[PDB]
């Protein structure tokens, strides 16, 4: 049993580590994840666990399902695997079937959580598993060193934690923390209540700017000033960020293990090994494609680490974004699609709406408009004003020092290149006119068009990813941060279209004309993605759009 | 047994195919080869065979040894594996030990060859294996549809083939041919003699320009005019070459299998699957990193297909290069290293030697000096004249259409880039002066220096390959044809240094002063490799060399 070995390790004074992975968005991602499992197992982790993300039908039977990732790890790889579980908006028989399948599939360890929106708290699930399936499953539960964000207080949260662990459970996994002192405080507090189950500290290695930028938003974590200050100059050079994160992790882990109150370190891998492996090797616990820079939904899809961090349970919708402010931003009600066009335009121009409220966000892009779109702002306003609703773009760039404050990245002393591209929704009429016009730009312009119905039109290769950003650096291969890939793009459509009726539509009633307008847009508008391959020349995307309008109008 | 299944396939009218691989030069090459084996096995090849190359100690115990490649294929992969064998300059007990090990290792099939320079002909080996190891091993033998190059005639060669197959053997593998008619002629001729063992036709898919260029040299094969003519315009665009080769292979194989006299097709893979897989899928026999463009010793070392084609047994030293002409070219005798410098200079300038003979070749570079060195000829003459003996180089190039007749390659409508680099030998004194001078070019210049003793000095990353040539093409990832890699470079030194005393030294007697000069050079001269990373600027390699000379002189 897991608890048994953990106690037969604690009593011997052995220190162990564990690794947390999340189901890859894509099948070849699953294959690469399994390869990662095999390679990391040589370190001798006590157990791995697979995150349970409610959004992506976790209890399904596809090769992406967390269930099957865990099942493959435990059967084929032999690694101890804990399957996470959530309760929010789940019915009794669904949970029952899931646990039955897990029993059949051999998921001997179930990690019980509550998730986020016949079960309300995590205590209810632990109690369901203990009542029905007996003591087959080993149950651990989440603990929070500073207090769950929405708890009334840290003391009542500790009381509820006691209640949970007393019902069932076997050990507590503790959310990431930046200083060992707080974890010691938490351990002592639990000790006073007499929580006998071991508490395992969560270690989050900062790996690239994206992780930091997401993490800083989480208020209660209170990222120390030092980390932000040091990173900020380095911000562009992710590799340096990773090194600093490794240094921080080693320091924190050394301080923890110095005390001996820590049975073992729980590392959130984010499906990226090198960082965690280096940290473990520095501590010395390591027993003994290289895609480690996901670049959100743009980088290599086949990478197991592919995926926007905001989809990770830790940063899933924490940016509350109150619905009343969204309603006041994008207009209380819409008279016609012209209103939608206006909203898209203001998001880029920045002038206040007629009601005086600036449109600060859109359903798709949450992050602030980067400083590269200053080179496209006028043309973007042009296209958006004329019904071409851009949701992403970048200018074509020739060789430029990697130290350029606007467009530079990567190891200093390199040269960085970009291909112009344009992601935008359009009316079916505009889409067809765009298809006709492109015929004369076929050689130099790559385009993907897809409807919510799934109909897809593309001239790019069926499965070859079109490289769009790359850099030349001394003594190193060619880095390709940004990619346009039909596979990543094709399923991305489902998210992009869903956002129309999920984030914007819900703001309006079911019979309101605004809802009808949004539904019309969601049903008919195409999703389009254009790339200009002639990067050493002037950006023709403006010209092709202009001739599309001239043909249509 | 292999013969058994082949006959139980022939009698049923089943058609089968086989795949031939060669031991990769590098360990990760072996791993990738094993992956290729696993993936190709889904086609259901009857048997694979592993080439036996005498040069690279084939009967060794490293992970590159053909023996162990075969052993891993048969044990771990389960694929029927034939181990090739050679006789030239091998002793009785070495062969005996090799076969004993094979028996222990489970290499149930031994392919008996003669190789090239107590055994003289392949008949002696087949007879040794049949005498000592009984009928455990299944023996096939090479046959030649047009006649072995050095045979007296095709009829006496056929008689000797009969003799060989009568002693032992079980089937004949036939060297590549371009037209099925000749194979039919060979089959009929053998039939008249009553060769009862099945004859398996060798299929060579042309995959890239390098293969064609090597193959055309082999006279007896007599490459049809059509292939050369069609390829020549395409020559630069390898992918198109591969497509044409696939078409040719499909046509030839269809014509063969139409007759029914062919039990099965034997494909020389060259450790590259896509081409062979496509051909098989076209025929329909397929049961059901992507590095497929080796670029000789420059491309990705980890690729199983890495390696100069001239090392392949088929094109191993066929370019006789008579020793008397080498002696008359590079000087009958040498008075000092100045003579070597003169030879190196003339190789690039092209003026006739004082004796009137033009220096057409050097031990290292056999291929004619490409048309890109016209952009460096004056500086190359400078450096060579001043004791910097270049054996490779390329100019730094910014964006240039891929259709450029001089430097273009790859899919049309791309942009091609190059980093300047310089491979050259130097005196130890010049080497140290170069090391001192480089300190001020450390940021932009990457350098590797290594001696025959193995001492190595480098500022590049320990194992990261420095990319030196790349191209930007529509709707495609960044292609990296040419790489500078410490791993490939580090063992390459052994070949480069060995050539000094093997190809040049042997021309002079053991006590001759010329031999002493060549030995001095081979012992003391460093092997150097410089790369200029600032490709959008003027080539500084000339400047750094000039300041190296200024410091020294
Ligand atoms: C290691 C770890 C892994 C995680 N994995 C995932 C994952 O895979 N998927 C995912 O969606 N989320 C995951 N989370 C996040 C977690 O699911 C959310 O924080 C969730 O909202 C809280 O679940 P819980 O287990 O704390 O349940 P609970 O403790 O029941 O809920 C937390 C809140 O409920 C309160 N509470 C608990 N019991 C009572 C009670 N009896 N009366 C009143 N209030 C009570 C607590 O005070 C606290 O405010 C993970 C968190 C951690 C630390
Ligand atoms: C399918 C295939 C695979 C190969 N694999 C390899 C490999 O892994 N490594 C490698 O180094 N080479 C390889 N070769 C090349 C081969 O080893 C060379 O061509 C070699 O020089 C000839 O060997 P052989 O088997 O024909 O032996 P032999 O037939 O003994 O030698 C060929 C020559 O000997 C003559 N000869 C044969 N018997 C007699 C006799 N009794 N009296 C007089 N003359 C005789 C023939 O007429 C012919 O001219 C391969 C060739 C083929 C077709
Ligand atoms: C992931 S980036 C694409 C650029 C690419 N990653 C690179 O290496 O430069 C997202 C970019 O899309 C641009 N852009 C984002 N949202 C846009 C919108 N609604 N309309 C027009 N342009 C937008 C922003 O400049 C933002 O920096
Ligand atoms: C999104 S791009 C550049 C975006 C935009 N052009 C800018 O600089 O503001 C930067 C990406 O390059 C990738 N990157 C990849 N390898 C890197 C490396 N060795 N060093 C630094 N960044 C790297 C990371 O995914 C990283 O997110
Ligand atoms: C494999 S290429 C290197 C260029 C690279 N492959 C590219 O993509 O352009 C070999 C080149 O080395 C150059 N060069 C070769 N031998 C040389 C020699 N002895 N001295 C100076 N330059 C040489 C020739 O131009 C030849 O084309
Ligand atoms: C050696 S380089 C260019 C040499 C030199 N610059 C010239 O053009 O004469 C060409 C290499 O690019 C690689 N190449 C790789 N991928 C290719 C592709 N899709 N199409 C064409 N060539 C490719 C091949 O290894 C091929 O040998």
Cα distances (Å, whole numbers) of residue A81 to A51, A75, A138, B363: 11, 10, 11, 58
**Contact between A334 and A498 (Cβ < 8 Å):** no
For the CA atoms of chain B, what is the radius of gyration? 25
* Domain map (residue ranges) of chain A: 2-206+247-288, 323-552
**Contact between A430 and A449 (Cβ < 8 Å):** no
Query: A150 has which bridge partners?
Result: none
Please judge whether B475 and A533 are an interchain contact, meaning their C-beta atoms are less than 8 angstroms apart: yes
Cα distances (Å, whole numbers) of residue A362 to A369, A386, A499, B283: 11, 18, 10, 53
Judged by a CB distance cut-off of 8 A, whether residue A411 touches chain B is: no
Q: Running DSSP on this structure, what letter comes out for residue A4?
A: H
Q: What's the longest Cα–Cα distance across chain B?
A: 79
**B151 Cα distance to chain centroid:** 25
Judge whether A57 is annotated as a binding position.
no
The strand pair at A526-532 and B16-21 is best described as unpaired
Count of CB atoms situated within 10 Å of the CB of B346? 21
Q: How far apart are CA A222 and CA A208, in angstroms?
A: 18
Q: Is the CB of A116 under 6 A from ligand 1?
A: yes
Candidate from B289, B446, B477 with C-beta closest to A480: B477
Candidate from B444, B465, B473 with C-beta closest to A474: B444
Residue A54: which of A250, A322, A311, A261 has the closest Cα?
A311
Cα distances (Å, whole numbers) of residue A325 to A358, A391, A504, B421: 10, 20, 12, 59
Q: Running DSSP on this structure, what letter comes out for residue A374?
A: G
Mutate to test the interface with A, among B401, B471, B472 (most CBs of A within 10 A): B472
Which tokens hold the place of A476? 């190193």
The strand pair at B264-268 and B16-21 is best described as parallel
Which entry of B20, B80, B273, B342 is annotated as an active-site residue?
Answer: B20
CATH class of B2-288: alpha beta
- Resolution at which this structure was determined, Å: 2.9
Measured between beta carbons, the chain B residues lying within 8 angstroms of A415 are 535-536
Size of interface A-B (CB pairs under 8 A): 78
Residue A530: which of A521, A517, A518, A539 has the closest Cα?
A539
**Contact between B266 and B253 (Cβ < 8 Å):** no
Q: Running DSSP on this structure, what letter comes out for residue B401?
A: B
Mutate to test the interface with B, among A299, A403, A443, A477 (most CBs of B within 10 A): A477
Q: How far apart are CA A72 and CA A64, in angstroms?
A: 11
Place of tokens 């000094």: B500
Which tokens hold the place of B196? 């009862």
Which entry of A4, A20, A94, A226 is annotated as an active-site residue?
Answer: A20
Residue B519: which of B265, B334, B367, B391 has the closest Cα?
B334
Q: How far apart are CA B345 and CA B386, in angstroms?
A: 10
C-alpha of residue B510 to centroid of ligand 6, in Å? 43
Place of tokens 């002639």: A534
C-alpha of residue B342 to centroid of ligand 1, in Å? 80
Buried b / exposed e across A248-274, counting CB within 10 Å, b at 16+?
bbbebbeebbeeebbbbbbbbbbbbbe
Judged by a CB distance cut-off of 8 A, whether residue A470 touches chain B is: yes
Residue B265: which of B223, B275, B273, B276 has the closest Cα?
B276
Alpha-helix residue ranges (DSSP H) falling in B194-237: 209-217, 225-234
Q: Is the CB of B414 under 6 A from ligand 6?
A: no
Q: How far apart are CA B89 and CA B112, in angstroms?
A: 15
Judged by a CB distance cut-off of 8 A, whether residue A196 touches chain B is: no
Measured between beta carbons, the chain B residues lying within 8 angstroms of A446 are 474-475
Q: Running DSSP on this structure, what letter comes out for residue A474?
A: T
Count of CB atoms situated within 10 Å of the CB of B446? 25
Query: B341, B346, B393, B396: which to mutate for ligand 5, most atoms within 8 A of CB?
Result: B393
CATH number of A2-206+247-288: 3.20.20.220
Phi-psi region of B60 (alpha: psi -120 to 50; beta: other; left: phi over 0): beta
3-state secondary structure A265-282: EEEECCCCHHHHHHHHHH
Q: How far apart are CA A172 and CA A87, in angstroms?
A: 18
Residue count of chain B, please give it.
553
The strand pair at B264-268 and B199-203 is best described as parallel
**Contact between A284 and A318 (Cβ < 8 Å):** no
Which residues have any ligand 3 atom within 6 Å of their CB? A 298, 347-348, 362, 365, 369-370, 372-373, 380, 390-394, 418, 469, 481-482
- Here the contacts of A295-298 (C-beta below 8 Å, separation 24 or greater) are A295/A210, A295/A481, A295/A482, A296/A210, A297/A488, A297/A492, A298/A468, A298/A481, A298/A482, A298/A483, A298/A484, A298/A488
3-state secondary structure B419-453: CCEEEEEECHHHHHHHHHHHHHHCCCEEEEEECCC
The strand pair at A171-174 and A138-143 is best described as parallel
Residue A489: which of A228, A313, A301 has the closest Cα?
A301
Count of CB atoms situated within 10 Å of the CB of B330? 25
Order of strands, sheet of B466-472, starting from the edge strand that comes earlier in the sequence: B415-418, B466-472, B479-484
Please state the atom number of ligand 1 nearest to the C-alpha of residue A157: 47
How was it solved? cryo-EM
Count of CB atoms situated within 10 Å of the CB of A101? 15
């Amino acid at each position: 049993r897991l608890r048994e070995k953990m106690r037969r390790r604690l009593e011997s004074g052995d220190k162990w580590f564990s690794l947390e992975f999340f189901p890859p968005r894509t099948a070849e991602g699953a294959v690469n994840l399994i390869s990662r499992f095999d390679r990391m197992a040589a370190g001798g982790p006590l157990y791995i666990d697979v995150t349970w993300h409610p959004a992506g039908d976790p209890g399904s039977d596809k090769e992406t399902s967390s269930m099957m990732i865990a099942s493959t790890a435990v059967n084929y790889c032999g690694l101890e695997t804990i399957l996470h579980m959530t309760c929010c908006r789940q019915r009794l028989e669904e949970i029952t079937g899931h646990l039955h399948k897990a029993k059949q599939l051999g998921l001997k360890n179930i990690m019980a959580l509550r998730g986020d929106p016949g079960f309300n708290y995590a205590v209810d699930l632990v109690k369901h598993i203990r009542s029905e399936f007996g003591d087959y499953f080993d149950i651990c539960v989440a603990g929070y060193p500073k207090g769950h964000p929405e708890a009334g207080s840290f003391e009542a949260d500790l009381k509820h934690l006691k209640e949970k662990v007393s019902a069932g459970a076997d050990f507590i996994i503790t959310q990431l923390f930046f200083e060992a002192d707080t974890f010691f405080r938490f351990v002592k507090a639990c000790t006073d209540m007499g929580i006998t189950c071991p508490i395992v500290p969560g270690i989050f290695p900062i790996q690239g700017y994206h992780s930091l930028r997401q993490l800083v938003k989480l208020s209660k974590l209170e990222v120390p000033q030092e980390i932000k200050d040091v990173i900020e100059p380095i911000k562009d050079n992710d590799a340096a960020i990773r090194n600093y994160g490794i240094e921080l992790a080693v320091s924190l882990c050394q301080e923890l293990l110095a005390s001996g109150l820590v049975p073992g370190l729980h590392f959130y891998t984010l499906n990226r090994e090198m960082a965690t492996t280096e940290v473990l090797k520095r501590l010395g616990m390591w027993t003994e494609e290289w895609d480690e820079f996901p670049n959100g939904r743009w980088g290599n899809s086949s990478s197991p680490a592919f995926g926007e961090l905001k989809d990770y349970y830790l940063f899933y919708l924490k940016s509350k974004s109150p619905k009343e402010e969204l309603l006041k931003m994008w207009g209380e009600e819409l008279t016609s699609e012209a209103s939608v066009f206006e909203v898209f335009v203001l998001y880029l121009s920045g002038e206040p709406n007629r009601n005086g409220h600036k449109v600060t966000c859109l359903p798709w892009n949450d992050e602030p408009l980067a400083a590269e779109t200053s080179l496209l702002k006028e043309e973007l306003l042009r296209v958006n004003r004329q019904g071409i609703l851009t949701i992403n773009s970048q200018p074509n760039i020739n060789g430029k020092p990697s130290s350029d404050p606007i467009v530079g990245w990567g190891p200093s002393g390199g040269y960085v290149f970009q291909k112009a591209y344009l992601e935008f929704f359009t009316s079916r009429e505009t889409a067809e006119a765009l298809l006709q016009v492109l015929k004369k730009y076929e050689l130099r312009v790559n385009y993907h068009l897809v409807n919510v119905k799934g109909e897809n039109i593309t001239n790019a290769p069926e499965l070859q990813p079109n490289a769009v950003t790359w850099g030349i650096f001394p003594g190193r291969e060619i880095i390709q941060p940004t990619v346009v890939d039909p596979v990543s793009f094709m399923f991305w459509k489902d998210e992009a279209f869903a956002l129309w009726i999920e984030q914007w539509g819900k703001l309006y009633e079911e019979e309101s004309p605004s809802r009808t307008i949004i539904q019309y847009i969601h049903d008919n508008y195409f999703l389009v993605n254009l790339v200009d391959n002639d990067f050493p020349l002037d950006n023709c995307l403006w010209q092709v759009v202009e001739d599309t309008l001239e043909l249509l109008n």
